């Protein structure tokens, strides 16, 4: 078999209808994963930091 004859990738390739179909999907997916990871990270950092603030039992305004 000649190395110049590229094997069949038809079942994997998409018809050139929108070359950016995959890109946009991939970028939205990455973008959303990063958005939610950032929200999650901020919430986690805040959860720990806030646990160091005055506990419920020492806020007595006697």
């Amino acid at each position: 078999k000649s190395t110049y004859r590229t094997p069949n990738f038809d079942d994997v390739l998409k018809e050139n209808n929108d070359a950016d179909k995959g890109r946009s999907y991939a970028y939205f997916m990455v973008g959303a994963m990063g958005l939610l990871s950032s929200a999650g990270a901020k919430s986690t950092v805040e959860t720990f930091i806030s646990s160091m603030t005055a506990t419920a039992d020492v806020l007595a305004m006697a």
């Binding site: 190395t3 094997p7 990738f9 994997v12 390739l13 998409k14 179909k21 995959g22 999907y25 991939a26």
Partner: protein, 93 residues
Amino acid sequence: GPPSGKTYMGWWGHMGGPKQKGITSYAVSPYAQKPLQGIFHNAVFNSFRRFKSQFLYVLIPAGIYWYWWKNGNEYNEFLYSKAGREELERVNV
């Protein structure tokens, strides 16, 4: 830097494998492939492949142990019921 020992793995450019000749490989950019739909086309279709090929190696020992457990569990239940106090006095002390 000091000389450390030889191992069976190296690094990029001298990994430690045999010389490779005659193999040609091809690949296509993920950006040029159908926006991932193989999650419910060749994953759910080809699903249970890893199942029906290996399940017996897991199911038989699983079944053997489950039966042994249920059998011993029921025997215990009987031994501690009114109907089993006679056999309980025997097998115990």
